[PDB]
Amino acid sequence: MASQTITVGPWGGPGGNEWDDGSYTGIRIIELSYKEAIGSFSVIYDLNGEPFSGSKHTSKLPYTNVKIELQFPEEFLVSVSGYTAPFSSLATRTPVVRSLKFKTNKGRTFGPYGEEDGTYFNLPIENGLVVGFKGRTGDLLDAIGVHMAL
Amino acid sequence: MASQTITVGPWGGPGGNEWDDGSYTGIRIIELSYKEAIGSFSVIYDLNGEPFSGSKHTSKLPYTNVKIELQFPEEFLVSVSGYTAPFSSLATRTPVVRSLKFKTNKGRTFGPYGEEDGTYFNLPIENGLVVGFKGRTGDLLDAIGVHMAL
Amino acid sequence: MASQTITVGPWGGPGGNEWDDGSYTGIRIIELSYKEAIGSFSVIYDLNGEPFSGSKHTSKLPYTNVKIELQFPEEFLVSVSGYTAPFSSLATRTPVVRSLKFKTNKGRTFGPYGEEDGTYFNLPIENGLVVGFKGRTGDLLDAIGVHMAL
Amino acid sequence: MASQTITVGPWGGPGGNEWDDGSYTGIRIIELSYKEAIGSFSVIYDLNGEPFSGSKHTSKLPYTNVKIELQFPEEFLVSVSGYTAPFSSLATRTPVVRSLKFKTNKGRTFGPYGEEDGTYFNLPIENGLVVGFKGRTGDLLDAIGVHMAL
Ligand SMILES: OC[C@H]1O[C@H](O)[C@H](O)[C@@H](O)[C@@H]1O
Ligand SMILES: OC[C@H]1O[C@H](O)[C@H](O)[C@@H](O)[C@@H]1O
Ligand SMILES: OC[C@H]1O[C@H](O)[C@H](O)[C@@H](O)[C@@H]1O
Ligand SMILES: OC[C@H]1O[C@H](O)[C@H](O)[C@@H](O)[C@@H]1O
Numbered sequence: 001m002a003s004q005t006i007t008v009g010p011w012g013g014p015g016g017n018e019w020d021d022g023s024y025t026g027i028r029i030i031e032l033s034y035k036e037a038i039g040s041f042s043v044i045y046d047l048n049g050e051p052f053s054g055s056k057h058t059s060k061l062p063y064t065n066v067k068i069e070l071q072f073p074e075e076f077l078v079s080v081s082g083y084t085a086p087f088s089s090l091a092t093r094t095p096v097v098r099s100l101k102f103k104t105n106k107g108r109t110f111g112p113y114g115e116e117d118g119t120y121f122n123l124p125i126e127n128g129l130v131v132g133f134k135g136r137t138g139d140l141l142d143a144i145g146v147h148m149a150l
Numbered sequence: 151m152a153s154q155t156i157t158v159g160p161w162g163g164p165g166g167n168e169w170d171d172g173s174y175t176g177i178r179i180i181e182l183s184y185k186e187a188i189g190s191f192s193v194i195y196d197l198n199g200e201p202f203s204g205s206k207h208t209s210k211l212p213y214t215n216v217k218i219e220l221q222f223p224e225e226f227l228v229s230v231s232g233y234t235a236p237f238s239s240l241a242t243r244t245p246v247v248r249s250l251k252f253k254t255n256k257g258r259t260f261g262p263y264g265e266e267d268g269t270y271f272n273l274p275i276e277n278g279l280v281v282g283f284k285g286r287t288g289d290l291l292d293a294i295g296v297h298m299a300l
Numbered sequence: 301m302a303s304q305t306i307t308v309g310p311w312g313g314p315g316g317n318e319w320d321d322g323s324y325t326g327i328r329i330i331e332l333s334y335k336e337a338i339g340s341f342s343v344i345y346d347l348n349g350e351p352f353s354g355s356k357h358t359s360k361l362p363y364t365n366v367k368i369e370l371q372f373p374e375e376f377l378v379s380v381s382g383y384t385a386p387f388s389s390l391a392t393r394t395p396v397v398r399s400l401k402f403k404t405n406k407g408r409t410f411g412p413y414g415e416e417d418g419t420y421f422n423l424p425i426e427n428g429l430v431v432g433f434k435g436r437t438g439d440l441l442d443a444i445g446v447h448m449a450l
Numbered sequence: 451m452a453s454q455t456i457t458v459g460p461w462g463g464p465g466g467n468e469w470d471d472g473s474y475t476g477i478r479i480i481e482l483s484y485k486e487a488i489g490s491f492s493v494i495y496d497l498n499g500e501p502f503s504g505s506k507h508t509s510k511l512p513y514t515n516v517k518i519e520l521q522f523p524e525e526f527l528v529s530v531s532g533y534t535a536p537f538s539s540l541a542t543r544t545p546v547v548r549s550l551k552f553k554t555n556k557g558r559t560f561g562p563y564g565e566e567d568g569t570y571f572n573l574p575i576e577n578g579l580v581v582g583f584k585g586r587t588g589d590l591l592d593a594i595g596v597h598m599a600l
Contacts, residue, residue: 002196002223003175003279003299006456006578006598022198025172026152046152047197048172048282073152120570126595128456131153132198145576148456148598149153150450156306156428156448270420276445278306295426298306298448300600301523302496303475303581303599322498325473326452346452347497348472348582373452429453449453 005131009145011121012084013095016138021045021054023132023147028072030102033063034114037087038097038141040065043133046072057137068102068110077130079103080146085118087140095119097141155281159295161271162234163244166288171195171204173282173297178222180252183213184263187237188247188291190215193283196222207287218252218260227280229253230296235268240289245269247291305431305447311421312384312443313395316436321345321354323432323447328372330402333363334413337387338397338441340365343433346372357437368402368410377430379403380446385418387440395419397441455581459595461571462534463545466588471495471504473582473597478522480552483513484563487537488547488591490515493583496522507587518552518560527580529553530596532561535568540589545569547591 005023026046033039039059045052070076083099098118101111123146132147155173174195183189189209195202220226232250236242248268251261273296282297305323326346333339339359345352370376382400386393399414423446432447455473474495483490489509495502520526532550536543548568551561573596582597 001226002199003281004577004600006600007576008458008573008578009576010574011572022175024153024197047202048170049152052197121572122461123573124459124461126457126459127454128458129153150454150456154427154450156450157426158308158448159424159426161422161424272311272421273423274309274311276307276309277304278308278448295424300304300306302499303579323475324453324497347502348470349452352497431453 005147005149007134007145007147008123010135010143011082011145012097012136012141012143015094015096016136016140016142018136019055019057020134021132023149024052025131026072026076027070027130029070030068031065032068032100032113033059033065035061035063036098036115038100038114039063041133041135041137041141041144045132057135059137059140061139066113070104071106075104075106075108077102077125078105079122079124080130081120081122082144083116083118083120094142097144100144155297155299157284157295157297158273160285160293161232161295162247162286162291162293163241164286165241165244165246166286166290166292168286169205169207170284171282173299174202175281176223177220177227177280179220180218181215182250182263183209183211183215185211185213186248186265188250188264189213189289191283191285191287191291191294195282207285207291209287209289211289216263220254221256225254225256225258227252228255228275229273230280231270231272233266233268233270237290241292244292247294305449307434307445307447308423309445310435310443311382311445312397312436312441314436314442315392315394315396316438316440316442318436319355319357320434321432323449324352325431326372327370327377327430329370330368331366332400332413333359333361333365335361335363336398336415338400338414339363339439341433341435341437341441341444345432354433357435357441359437359439361439366413370404371406375404375406375408377402378405378425379423380430381420381422382414382444383416383418383420394442397444400444455597455599457584457595457597458573460585460593461532461595462547462586462591462593464586465542465544465546465592466586466590468586469505469507470584471582473599474502476522476526476579476581477520479520480518481515482550482563483509483515485513486539486548486565488550488564489513491583491585491587491591491594507585507591509587509590511589516563520554525554525556525558527552527575528555529572529574530580531570531572533566533568533570537590544592547594
């Protein structure tokens with residue numbers, strides 16, 4: 001009964017534990033870690049002109065960390081894409097987010113991070129904004145979904 | 151540029167200094183002060199299930215303080231109304247918000263607070279939710295407007 | 301169920317029979333009739349770049365006909381306002397729409413139509429667009445409300 | 451412009467003429483034709499409780515026609531997916547939509563129609579409704595996108 005946003009996804013599997021950051025007014029910074037798949041994933045959002053830190057979604061796997069810094073508000077995501085598949089190590093197992101790639105309205109590209117292994121997904125946005133992320137994390141990013149608004 | 155909401159108003163006059171709390175997921179508490187007019191006006195928002203304290207828009211005048219606590223999220227505002235006019239010592243030239251009055255979907259009325267003098271304003275909400283307030287404040291609540299989503 | 305819009309109002313009384321044109325993409329023309337109150341009310345909407353005629357909410361009373369033609373798409377409404385009150389030769393007793401006035405982003409004012417008797421209502425719009433009207437009609441316009449979108 | 455919706459995609463290629471049906475209040479019927487790719491694509495939308503026929507984007511090619519009738523408003527689309535790739539049979543090997551598939555909230559699957567050749571696409575919708583389709587059609591369905599609303 002509170003305020004809601006359009007939500008697309010998830011892409012990824014049933015594994016790991018639900019999270020949902022909720023909705024805000026834009027993206028400032030995305031922080032992720034990666035190796036053979038995506039590990040950690042966390043976001044500094046914009047909330048009405050000031051940063052808001054989302055709950056951290058940390059894998060303790062010793063992965064490479066990266067800070068994607070957007071030129072907010074003039075720069076914003078126009079595409080979120082990536083690959084989903086199992087990672088061999090979880091014995092018998094369930095699809096995770098192997099790769100993420102981001103494009104901005106400025107023509108910047110971030111990534112691809114991880115390994116482009118498995119089934120492709122792609123959210124090209126023609127009109128609208130990413131205003132929040134949701135997903136599932138175990139030892140790593142099992143699934144990812146986006147909230148959108150105008 | 152960042153996420154936007156439907157915004158109605160303002161009601162009141164061009165005095166004091168502008169402010170805009172922006173948009174959130176809902177309303178938990180409204181804090182105001184009053185006597186002949188509205189003084190202080192501040193809001194505790196809901197942002198994704200937790201409280202978020204908006205910026206204070208305080209008056210130093212010795213007015214009566216009231217704290218409006220809604221049972222969010224099942225309770226919500228379905229009307230905002232009030233009167234605007236000069237208050238003929240500190241706002242001789244421009245109208246301020248003299249009164250405010252809120253109704254909820256559970257049939258609680260809060261107010262009228264202040265004095266019911268001058269030009270009526272009335273926003274019944276048939277569908278949608280008040281997500282944020284903006285206004286103008288000097289020693290008094292010169293102006294107010296509302297951001298809406300759903 | 302089906303897609304929805306933010307809707308505000310009603311302004312007016314409970315007589316007459318309810319009607320709801322629904323939501324569209326914008327406004328091309330408003331047709332009304334007036335004398336001491338508003339009679340007829342009907343709209344030619346924009347629907348994805350072509351006109352779409354709303355049901356006619358006509359009155360048989362001997363009133364003056366007005367057509368408000370907007371320069372769509374560049375011209376849109378930014379204020380809907382008016383007055384409500386009972387009307388003397390009313391076989392019943394409850395409030396009707398005595399007057400309506402509209403302003404646009406091009407600084408055109410259409411009206412007041414009717415008489416400015418009774419209780420004032422005013423919807424300034426700072427962000428978003430009139431995408432439909434609802435109301436109540438008998439021999440006169442008993443009430444009026446507005447759907448809004450981005 | 452006039453009123454807007456969140457728009458995602460397009461998926462497919464830059465061939466054949468632009469079309470955009472715009473936005474409505476939901477979907478009733480989708481009509482398409484298929485064989486090696488999608489040819490024809492047209493939609494009967496809901497508009498405020500009544501059917502509204504979108505513009506026809508017919509293919510002349512001698513393809514198999516199908517009619518997808520959703521039990522509107524209780525049933526609606528929760529996934530749009532498909533495949534894009536060039537089609538040997540046009541000399542222009544600009545990518546067209548080779549197949550589509552539609553799932554609903556009741557567990558119905560319509561498709562796949564056409565052949566599942568080239569790059570997958572997939573829009574699963576967690577919250578929100580498809581209100582509109584946009585695309586590109588020459589000989590065949592070159593590309594497709596969706597408008598979403600709440
Ligand atoms: O997140 C990747 C995997 O990590 C952990 O091993 C979880 O137990 C498993 O459910 C999840 O799929
Ligand atoms: O807020 C009431 C009034 O008082 C302030 O002290 C300001 O100087 C004036 O601009 C404002 O209209
Ligand atoms: O519209 C004015 C009035 O007109 C009609 O006569 C109706 O019977 C009444 O219900 C309504 O209030
Ligand atoms: O519709 C599929 C193809 O057929 C048409 O004839 C167009 O000329 C071409 O641009 C398009 O890619």
